[PDB]
């Protein structure tokens, strides 16, 4: 952690770099019912969805976590 | 039954309660003064007070140098970290040799920590997300919260998560009817398996079936962990295990060694000292064993002079079998055991001595009775004379072909004819050199 | 603070000097070497004045004669907030950095910038938390009651303070510290309620805290180079920082010093075993010493008239003459027997070892005979031999037993030369067989 | 811990430093893939690679690798 | 107060308008011919017409080669680029040495671009966007202590505003030419909307909303070369953490340098920029390899090379990387034939005494006359640098016994405490075990 | 262009007649008649283009005109013909083999020629109306492009709608669309709409509104070397490797396939081969492995004409322990043809010095030119060439226009050549650092 005492701009920049929505969305996936909500109930087409599902697949189920 | 390899008849130094050594005890024969000196060194390590004490084991080949270090490691026990090493291993192609030496220095100081965990666990009963008002706004995720209902034994809790925890949950591929395990220290989620409250025989993906977890959903448990300083240094230099982007992409790229700075080691030392001050942690110094120390060159020796004077260094044990040889990386420096005199001034040399006919004979007896072999007395005397004539290791390594040649004749006892046949079939260094000298085309 | 078992130089707390820079016969764990200690005191005053940059000091003498001890005493007497960098000679032969780049990083790690700043902190004991949630969750209202031993107040929270209090879960009775501008909440512990444990704060709830920062030039060089993050200060792969980003840092530091926003704190760079550097490193040092942002360099070596590395000639102290022209030399001498006895008594006192007078005389005699370091090493071994016999003090017989068990250099050389057929020589010949 | 002076004088733009001016000068006004000044090089590279748009090289050269 | 480091009593070459040298001027004592030759070289650099001129200045140690190079750099001024270098710096573990040599060659050619800075800052009083789902333009109202001012804005600047989480009542910073948006913080007029808040509160600008300023930018050709040759990609303006791949140096092709050259020529043709060639200084040139010595011959024949200055203090010495090439000053005859050689003479007794007096009076030390004579007599027998380095311990020993003038007792004490090279070598020879 | 006065910038081609007969003083070259005739023969062999893989070695003493001859060949070769000039020390890379660096140098010197037809429609956008069908599968666009002189209206396809809705234009940007192919570019914004938005923006620039005809026809001829095709066809985005040099040991299959397709394109008539010259100055410091690769690499039809320059005598070839003429092994010298240069006399030195004085805009007297010619006879030639430029500044400090004898004498006193420096070192060798590092810094003993 890098801290600067008394500056909200540092906190905003650090939170933007650590939790950038484009890369965090790329390494994750949208829920299916949420996808049905924004496609059918809101009219957004498929091609302007944010890109998802780019995380690599593990070898087993056993290799998915350190616990 | 088991597998034996050049050792494992040695269990310890075999000393008394007052430090004196029995002649035949602990798998050792002879070497009384060296065993007593190693016992004094073992007591010094167990005192847990000193830093950077270094000794050197000197003597000829097949005299019992590495056996003493292995006996030291067996006498100390498994709770003390012991790091075996060979001098040729410090020459890496990814990082400089100084960093490899300092990493192996920090790998020999252990730490025992009583840490506590915050755990949410149970069987998933519901999984409903709530969407955001502007999904294509560019800033912020698609969802806002996710409602998760967990049910354990005599308990039921409902949780409201951010998208950050739910991203790891759906990376674990969590469905309805699974038993999960959320660790609040790092956000890590483990999917234990399907619950046994439903049907079992209608699956196709070799899952395991888990009963409901006992106790409440929210828990606090104490775990005793055993780590080293090098583990903390490596985990802080290459961060993994967070839920941010940087620690997530760190698990996917290829790992590589890096030159860890002194500032990171100082900060890790500060945090560890703070943990000790609260009565949580406890320091366990250990032993670093560098075998074949003549393979090092002058730069590693000059850095070792600096590294021994630090206030954290463990006990270093070296071994060498050179009389008066030139130090590697130099031309004119001739020093005993291949070790430069400024490093020799900081050591404590323990001498090892060669054996006799009786010690060779009883060592052959011990190695034969370890390997589940039955040897006659005349064959034993023949092997003892063979060992004194050529080498101890050549007599030790000829036991198993003798046993095979005895077994192939439907026999259990090893006799003189098997030893003569093994003499004929297999040679040693002196007879091979004799064949090499009287030969035509570079045999 | 600063965990350590027992160091080899742990007994030295600094140079033993009075107000007129004269050495006491025994002070602060340093015995003897009066001229060298006076010269090191003059050098320490030169560092403390801060008006002199880029001076090189060489410490030369026989091995095991107070060379590293002198630099350890200087580093202790320097105090905090002054940078001290100690590297060995063989540490700069890297694989991912050139030698001149590693030398530049080591040079710029020893110049500091002192910045004082002000901030507002709220630190108190939490009395009660009231958080109400609507069914829709459109707005969050709340009230926070916090107190010290002298005051008591109740606050009304906004939305993001409520979110930052729900995260990092704060209950009643906790002692927390809140930063208003950055929104960081640190749990200092739990107050004295038995139902880790920290006393309740006193005085005002809102306070002004002046923090004095000390940042090295190397950290600003790493941060201002946009190709690398600040994580390169810990991972170590800065990777040959470009030359043109350092002049901007130099001009900015000069501007800050002119405007009064910052102060320059020079430090000491210590190079131990300087004879292992190459000729290119010496040629780089010859020009790096003439910079205005250059620290005071202390180098130590024990060789005499040896071959300089990378060349094929011999030079005094293993260093070329153009580097020796730029240096002033401090020479150390060998120790007397009384100073050996005093040093051994200090080392035995450090390790809480009780010695008899006859054991001390035997150790002093065998230290004069062989080495100071050998007699220093024998003390802790003989102590464990004493605890084997279940008595506290260390007698003569324990020292004789330890002397019999553990050899020195000359006896090992004698045993090697008497039986050189059993060892591996320079030609790779050995005789493992006992008979014939 | 980092002081506010470094972050406010070396990284953030203000009236007394030229972070943004020099950034624009290096990255736009002297970029060799600029179609307003180096149309010939862009046309040559478009014939070479077969890109349908001549602004593709300027967008590629000023975009981080992960985002690309 | 003031930091003095082995130099900074040198302020210039000390020449008048006719080019001749005064004896004591600009911190220089003696050395008339080398100073006059360096003045001629300074005029040649100021003429701004040649390319690839190479001067080597040679002489014994401690005669003033580096002082002369720094005096040239001080005579030229801060506008002209000057890249000091050591010969050992050309060996790197990332690229070949010819790449580092060409980078240092191109780092010594500069540019001068006239720019302007236009800044709008103040408190936001109105933020009303309109669309046609694409926003057409955004009207933003700004307020300061001297009044208010409304603006029209680009949709891209609106996206930059929306990135920074800017609402009504914050204090923002907008640059007109670049488009950079920085959020300073919330105004202090909204400080009492809540008792506890995460937001920081700042006062209003006392200035006007609109500010205008003219600035001059100085860049080199290597800056544009490294700006156009980023291999991972163009990074953001603000990034506290680095990239996921570490970018290394690369062998930059000649095509990129040609493209940069033609772009810079086009911008020079419109009068926007001005070309200022500079000086590349390589100290301790004897440490270069034979391959770099060969590549210097090719690099000195280009159309864009700067003026190169080399220094060495060697006699008949073998060139590095060879076996049997005895050459003067450690420089092969191929490069020697392309050079001009300036000699540097040693000093007399009185010149040494005057140099010691000048070095005493820059460091704010008062020296008695007999101490000055004894220091000058010591300096003629060991070295000049030994007597120059002994002034600070003499001043410290004078300050210890509560005095301000250096007396011969302090000089004798400092001579006793600190040894020179010859006495240390005499101790080294007559000793038993490693000194 | 961007250039100052270089070492030999007065040379513009070899001064040869139509019969390859060198004039004594023409096009900036003086003397060296046989070498210039030989270089004219080599130039004609390059311009014929039917002979591949020839090695020419230029050997002579230093300061004779080998690289001046190569500069004359390069200038008289003409445009759009590749001429790669490298030094011998450039192939010792850290991320490239010597064989691969030599292959990349060889393939940079032979190129192909490609011509294409452009029908550009460059103008300023007035109004774009986007219309879609009820089904939405068909998209039509009303494009109102406008130049200064006129304005017309086009109908756009759905691919133009997709290509314009990415990098969106805002009715007043300057775009140009190719009619035949369909290349889309956005040049910037017009100067007429530069006052309405009150702030610039991050990624915009102001260009002038184009004039003249809206539709223009132009043919463009491109010259592409083989190395560009190798770099492009080896990766997803290869032009960054073209400009940053991180190609990194390209495989052989792509080179074989590129050779095959270049041959079949020459057969089809789309492209034609333009060979060129590779020049390796100071060739004597190459390894023996580089020499073996050069021996084998000259036997291919896709090989340029290689020109090498050496000033060594009978020296030791690097990587071995013996000596050879010119520092080159005998099997490479068997595969070679040697052009020999000879040292100059007084008249040629005088003419070269007068040419260099006219190049640098320096006015010399007759006596100053005679003194410089005498100095260039005694010392080398480059010493007098540099003495000219410093004597100009010395005379300029004296408030004089023409360089006199006194300025030349002062420049001779202030700056030393190699011989006086060697004498002054050899008579005072105690003050300089020797081979053993011994020196005497103290002035008294
Ligand atoms: N005192 C002993 N008792 C039993 N076995 C021994 C003894 N000393 C040596 N050995 C055996 O002889 C061999 C000696 O090898 P080791 O001690 O590992 O290194 P070195 O060959 O250098 O002495 C080992 O395999 C060990 O098992
Ligand atoms: N004057 C002194 N006071 C206290 N301890 C000393 C003194 N001189 C030497 N020592 C001790 O002697 C040992 C060797 O000295 P050291 O300076 O470390 O080695 P070297 O002289 O080779 O650098 C150290 O443990 C140090 O503590
Ligand atoms: N003419 C002079 N006047 C004043 N100081 C001088 C003069 N010549 C040399 N010096 C000083 O002598 C020292 C040695 O000069 P320098 O050029 O740095 O070393 P070298 O001559 O060995 O390269 C420098 O610190 C410089 O300040
Ligand atoms: N024939 C010539 N005509 C004009 N100038 C020449 C001629 N030959 C040599 N020169 C000049 O001599 C200088 C050095 O000659 P150069 O071509 O470098 O020979 P080399 O490469 O053998 O040293 C160059 O500046 C060049 O201008």
Curated annotation (Swiss-Prot), chain A:
Top-level lineage group: Eukaryota
Protein localization: Nucleus
Other comment: Present with 1110 molecules/cell in log phase SD medium.
Family: Belongs to the SNF2/RAD54 helicase family.
Domain remark text: The DBINO region is involved in binding to DNA.
Its job: ATPase component of the INO80 complex which remodels chromatin by shifting nucleosomes and is involved in DNA repair. Its ability to induce transcription of some phosphate-responsive genes is modulated by inositol polyphosphates. The INO80 complex is involved in DNA repair by associating with 'Ser-129' phosphorylated H2A histones as a response to DNA damage.
Assembly and interaction partners: Component of the chromatin-remodeling INO80 complex, at least composed of ARP4, ARP5, ARP8, RVB1, RVB2, TAF14, NHP10, IES1, IES3, IES4, IES6, ACT1, IES2, IES5 and INO80.
Protein's name in the database: Chromatin-remodeling ATPase INO80
Species whose genome carries this gene: Saccharomyces cerevisiae (strain ATCC 204508 / S288c)
UniProtKB/Swiss-Prot annotation, chain B:
Cystine residue pairs: none
Enzyme class: hydrolase
InterPro entries referenced in this protein's UniProt entry, alphabetically: AAA+_ATPase (IPR003593), P-loop_NTPase (IPR027417), RuvB-like (IPR027238), RuvB-like_C (IPR041048), RuvBL1/2_DNA/RNA_bd_dom (IPR042487), TIP49_P-loop (IPR010339)
GO cellular component, one term: nucleus
Domain of life according to the entry: Eukaryota
Subunit structure: Probably forms a homohexamer. Interacts with RVB2 and may form heterododecamers with RVB2. Component of the SWR1 chromatin remodeling complex composed of at least ACT1, ARP4, RVB1, RVB2, ARP6, YAF9, VPS71, VPS72, SWC3, SWC4, SWC5, SWC7 and SWR1, and perhaps BDF1. Component of the chromatin-remodeling INO80 complex, at least composed of ARP4, ARP5, ARP8, RVB1, RVB2, TAF14, NHP10, IES1, IES3, IES4, IES6, ACT1, IES2, IES5 and INO80. Component of the R2TP complex composed of at least RVB1, RVB2, TAH1 and PIH1. Interacts with SPT15/TBP and HSP90.
Protein name per UniProt: RuvB-like protein 1
Taxonomic lineage: Eukaryota, Fungi, Dikarya, Ascomycota, Saccharomycotina
From Swiss-Prot, chain C:
Subcellular location: Nucleus, Nucleoplasm
GO cellular component: chromatin; Ino80 complex; NuA4 histone acetyltransferase complex; nucleus; R2TP complex; Swr1 complex; TTT Hsp90 cochaperone complex
Example of a GO biological process term: chromatin remodeling
First-level EC class: hydrolase
Cited InterPro entries: AAA+_ATPase, P-loop_NTPase, RuvB-like, RuvB-like_C, RuvBL1/2_DNA/RNA_bd_dom, TIP49_P-loop
EC number: 3.6.4.12
Source organism superkingdom: Eukaryota
Keyword Nucleus listed: yes
Reaction(s) the record says it catalyses: ATP + H2O = ADP + phosphate + H(+)
Gene Ontology terms, MF aspect: 3'-5' DNA helicase activity; 5'-3' DNA helicase activity; ATP binding; ATP hydrolysis activity; DNA helicase activity
Chain residues that bind ATP: 61-68
Task performed by this protein: DNA helicase which participates in several chromatin remodeling complexes, including the SWR1 and the INO80 complexes. The SWR1 complex mediates the ATP-dependent exchange of histone H2A for the H2A variant HZT1 leading to transcriptional regulation of selected genes by chromatin remodeling. The INO80 complex remodels chromatin by shifting nucleosomes. Its ability to induce transcription of some phosphate-responsive genes is modulated by inositol polyphosphates. The INO80 complex is involved in DNA repair by associating to 'Ser-129' phosphorylated H2A histones as a response to DNA damage.
Further facts: Present with 3030 molecules/cell in log phase SD medium.
Name assigned to this protein: RuvB-like protein 2
Organism, scientific name: Saccharomyces cerevisiae (strain ATCC 204508 / S288c) (Baker's yeast)
